[PDB]
Write a protein that binds this ligand. Structure first.
Ligand SMILES: O=C(NCCOP(=O)(O)O)c1ccc(OC(F)(F)F)cc1
Ligand SMILES: O=C(NCCOP(=O)(O)O)c1ccc(OC(F)(F)F)cc1
Ligand SMILES: *Cc1c(COP(=O)(O)O)cnc(C)c1O
Ligand SMILES: *Cc1c(COP(=O)(O)O)cnc(C)c1O
Ligand code: NA
Ligand code: NA
Lengths: 395, 255, 395, 255
């Protein structure tokens, strides 16, 4: 029995060991209560505003679209405190943890952004934060690891399985299964078992709500489409949620195509994976033919969740949202273009969304279109990555 | 087939608890794993719980995580696991054989085809680790259509609703999770499948303790796998240590 | 003859070769005109809002002040686009350059933040940007150098003199002296010859204006003091300007004390230098006994301007503002403390201001005081610096 | 002392322009710099313009930037520059000696004491490179109190106000910046100090060109310093090349 629907059509659910079900039902109850509580909402709104810096700007990109009939806006989550959208939902989850009387936070992280976000929320709100991160990731992400440590979080390297995000996700769940009385599990995307896909959507939905108000203000109409990159699905569902019932607004999610779909070296499970059951949910995932879970590959480490949020899979199935993919090279070009033409360094994650909007524009330059790209984060973190490619490719 | 029912009737006749070891199929390789299982049986295992290597065993502690890694290192696949299961059944016609599976491996290529395959190799039960009772309908239905017992974990804190569901939905045995007299009696009250206590069972006094509490017997996982892990360098020493541990554990079930 | 006063008491002026005076008078005229032009103001306000992300948050720091009678707010310039306050005034100077019909931008930079800021403003506004940076600085600041390049700016290493900021400042002036018909010189602080101290103040003054509105809103009174780090003086004058006539509000500027004043290895010319004439102005500066110009030393490379804005020297002389210093170690501690207690990674520059506010609190913990620290920038850039110190000091 | 006035009267009598070389004091070292200056005089320099090494010469191109670096490398200080100036005056009683200074070095330890020191060593003029006429009051007043000529740059584009100020405030000579007939005539009209053309003067035909235009002569900076820079490895070769260049330049001023 639950209060809310744990499914989006066929996808989602609560596929967890029996010992973890009380934790999930507890969390769902707290959330339903919090969502009804004006004081919770006021506290959450206050941290968003006065700590995180909301509302974020909606920037019109004139140089980029010059000589086309595309008007392109970027939703500026890169300007949020911590430099990516993840900060929104960790503040809400932190507030939930406090509402339930928990004093400790567990989080998983791959590239480290979610770990950083969880660590800053915990430091602000006085929670003891421990972070699981695959051993290979700890090795590859020294800057985020030191941010987490400077913020007082305990970083725990995970050596099991592939020593990556998949394996930190398992270890987070194993820890929580024994510690949930005192620890909240701060999941890092709109995926995993119910109620996490719903909670994370609702704690990211100010992205789309602001975007709608801002575009009405500046253009007097809704966007023809909103475009967001899809790693696990949080930034994209945050952008999409308030537009779902505005049926003229296209919702386009962009998965990483890596070296190219046909190479198999990609992270596009929604469109190129197969439904499986893992990480507490029924969803498309990267998996072998006999059902072992695989890694997602992208130039962008933040898009390495080997599955996708069940709401995305559902929105795709009924044709409400469309999902596409963008390769490493297309993402690199869009990164280069934004820096040079708009003076904004975008996250390589966010560059997938931008690359798709540039395609929509370039392919049909006389098509009248009003587009918003969710610029989910800033790309300071990616400057060496983009250097050592334009170094190894001469340039 | 009614192998758990036959075993529990036979055990009750002899005033005896079940001892049920867990191992990972194909740890540390197929050939050695087959010898390990034959040794557990020869030493007095009443039934077997057998794990199929899965990439992301999110219900498992480090010992079992390592067993999986060892099996994967040897190239063990679920298809090879099923060939092994056929051979095991064919050597040992009456011993209940239970699988411990992750949902993806059951769901992967069709829930119904998975349980049909279990029936064909002569498996008796399947516990799907990350399928709670709330999510279990298509699994337990598929199992029952293929004469397979769906096993459910009854956790240490189950409320009455959960006890009633586990009692109603399970067959074969109820996996009673350690981490007490209330749970055993309610399970009996609701006519649940006989309870086996598992999780941290590593000493003979734990086995006698379980039976005394009113459990039908004990499941020991990590303890058996620990012996494998400790003796990788010496396969003969491994079997001998396995033999010794199993008979000790089994003797403790003789009340 | 000028339209505005080029002096703040005895300090300031226009000490430039005669060939550069027309450039300065032209720039002054354009500025006076722009300051009267509602359309200029509306364009500048629009870029601040929709591109840079203004207004920036005013954050109350509860954890930090626990058990004292200090209430501490941080003005969040770290949340501005580009991650430091410098973005405000480069957008205004870019708009001035366009108003004068210039198509090229010259800028100097030390640690690189000003170079990055000038490069993004230029990329946005379609200006051809060239940046002079001392050869030693180019070597030491690879991340900022690549940001500048990704944004289309030409980075020109300066090998003359000490190959640092002093020497990039000279080279900027030498270039402009021959190129001013087509190039605007985008000076990076509230210093240099008139009209630059005045222009930069006015294009940073939204910092203090916002702070005043926000503190009135949240506390219903003005701060007892506003505290800002002083490298060249821009962030601090931006914070101070709107409070100058609010005589109960203390204005405290914090110079870098480096290894300690008594060591001579510091960057505190306002209080520990000697008045000289250099970089177009009469101001306190770091200089030898016979008047050769020296470098400023700080752990924080952004506080290396070897002089200070003439308005600061003036404000000090009449006792309107007080100036203090903070050592590398005190700055490091304040950096550590903010990360761990507030989940905000501050620039090491900004950490000097914070360190001083922590001193005011700790020295007199039962003193009722309402303080605002200008958090001039974010400290992502400083994470390795702070690592390799807490590494070399064991810890 | 009236050394520029005496020189210009003597030159006009001989229908001759001035040739005025610039060097940095103490480039490439004190001893060699003294020999360089003696060679420029022996070769026909009508007057000298002498730079004092300053850390941040923001009015100077690369050639002069390097001369400064060379002097600093040799440990040359303004105090040593002043000792050198005393020796130079004492060898050569009538040659006008002008300094090219940066403001900080003038202002450093008191503007008035700086010009008093110039008077004591027998300097005739001071051009302060980063003091425009707008800022010049305390400099030109101090200079005049100490019988020193304050020199001002008249830039290629000066409006009438600037011409009138330069005419009024300068003495000795007006430094006419190259980067034309209008400026010379207006300067004459406003009774300015005689104009010397400088900046890029590097060939004898430039010298004759200046005098023909109505300038009183030519100032050559970088060209002389370039010869120093080219001949660092060979001090004797350096003087000989300096000797040759100076006499060539000076011959061109004989109209
Ligand atoms: O029987 C099992 N393995 C060994 C248990 O014994 P030990 O290893 O001694 O704890 C076992 C049973 C169920 C399980 O998952 C869940 F509880 F979620 F369903 C995980 C392991
Ligand atoms: O006489 C000078 N040096 C040599 C000039 O000759 P050249 O080196 O051939 O250009 C000279 C004169 C003035 C000056 O500064 C300023 F114009 F600003 F006042 C800089 C150099
Ligand atoms: C982590 C991250 C993502 C991907 O996560 P979602 O849950 O799919 O949003 C995208 N963009 C940025 C900047 C990130 O840090
Ligand atoms: C450059 C910089 C400073 C110092 O410059 P001011 O002109 O004195 O403000 C201070 N803080 C940050 C974050 C900077 O980048
Ligand atoms: Na994914
Ligand atoms: Na300074």
């Amino acid at each position: 029995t639950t209060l809310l629907n744990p499914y989006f059509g066929e996808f989602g659910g609560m596929y967890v060991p029996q010992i973890l079900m009380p934790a999930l039902n507890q969390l769902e109850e707290a959330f339903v209560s919090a969502q009804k509580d004006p004081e919770f909402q006021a506290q959450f709104a206050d941290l968003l505003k006065n700590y995180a810096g909301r509302p974020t700007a909606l920037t019109k990109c004139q140089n980029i679209t010059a000589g086309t009939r595309t008007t392109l806006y970027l939703k500026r989550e890169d300007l949020l405190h911590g430099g990516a959208h993840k900060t929104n939902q960790v503040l809400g989850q932190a507030l939930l943890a406090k509402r339930m009387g928990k004093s400790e936070i567990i989080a998983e992280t791959g590239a480290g952004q979610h770990g950083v976000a969880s660590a800053l929320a915990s430091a602000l709100l006085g929670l003891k934060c421990r972070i699981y991160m695959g051993a290979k990731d700890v090795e590859r992400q020294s800057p985020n690891v030191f941010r987490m440590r400077l913020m007082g979080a305990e970083v725990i390297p995970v050596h099991s399985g592939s020593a990556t995000l998949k394996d930190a996700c398992n270890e987070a769940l194993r820890d929580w299964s024994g510690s949930y009385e005192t620890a909240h599990y701060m999941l890092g995307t709109a995926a995993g078992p119910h109620p996490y896909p719903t909670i994370v959507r609702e704690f990211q939905r100010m992205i789309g709500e602001e975007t709608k108000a801002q575009i009405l203000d500046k253009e007097g109409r809704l966007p023809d489409a909103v475009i967001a990159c899809v790693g696990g699905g949080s930034n994209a569902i945050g952008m999409f949620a308030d537009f779902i019932n505005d049926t003229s607004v296209g919702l386009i999610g962009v998965e990483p195509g890596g070296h190219g779909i046909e190479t198999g070296e990609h992270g596009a499970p929604l469109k190129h994976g197969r439904v499986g059951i893992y990480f507490g949910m029924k969803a498309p995932m990267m998996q072998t033919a006999d059902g072992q879970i695989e890694e997602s590959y992208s130039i962008s480490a933040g898009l390495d969740f080997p599955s996708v949020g069940p709401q995305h899979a559902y929105l795709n199935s009924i044709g409400r949202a469309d999902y596409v993919s963008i390769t490493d090279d297309e993402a690199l070009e869009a990164f280069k273009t934004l820096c040079r033409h708009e003076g904004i360094i975008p996250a390589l994650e966010s560059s997938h969304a931008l690359a798709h909007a540039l395609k929509m524009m370039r392919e049909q330059p006389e098509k009248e279109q009003l587009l918003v790209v969710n610029l989910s984060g800033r790309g300071d973190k990616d400057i060496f990555t983009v250097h050592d490619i334009l170094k190894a490719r001469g340039e | 087939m009614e192998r758990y029912e036959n075993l529990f009737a036979q055990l009750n006749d002899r005033r005896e608890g079940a001892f049920v070891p867990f191992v990972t199929l194909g740890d540390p390789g197929i050939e050695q794993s087959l010898k390990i299982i034959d040794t557990l049986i020869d030493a007095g295992a009443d039934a077997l719980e057998l794990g199929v290597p899965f990439s992301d065993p999110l219900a498992d502690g480090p010992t079992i995580q390592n067993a999986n890694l060892r099996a994967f290192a040897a190239g063990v696949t679920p298809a090879q696991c099923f060939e092994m299961l056929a051979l095991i059944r064919e050597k040992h016609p009456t011993i209940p054989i239970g699988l411990l599976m992750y949902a993806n491996l059951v769901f992967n290529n069709g829930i119904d085809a998975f349980y049909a395959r279990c029936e064909q190799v002569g498996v008796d039960s399947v516990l799907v680790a990350d399928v709670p009772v709330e999510e279990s309908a298509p699994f337990r239905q598929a199992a029952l259509r293929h004469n397979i017992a769906p096993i459910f974990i009854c956790p240490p804190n189950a409320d009455d609703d959960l006890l009633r569901q586990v009692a109603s939905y399970g067959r074969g045995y109820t996996y009673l999770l350690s981490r007490l007299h209330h749970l055993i009696e309610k399970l009996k009250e609701y006519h649940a499948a006989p309870a086996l206590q598992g999780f941290g069972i590593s000493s003979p006094e734990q086995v006698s303790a379980a039976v005394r509490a009113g459990a039908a017997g004990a499941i020991s996982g990590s303890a058996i796998v620990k012996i494998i892990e400790k003796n990788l360098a010496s396969p003969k020493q491994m079997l001998a240590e396995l033999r010794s541990f199993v008979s000790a554990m089994k003797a403790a079930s003789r009340a």
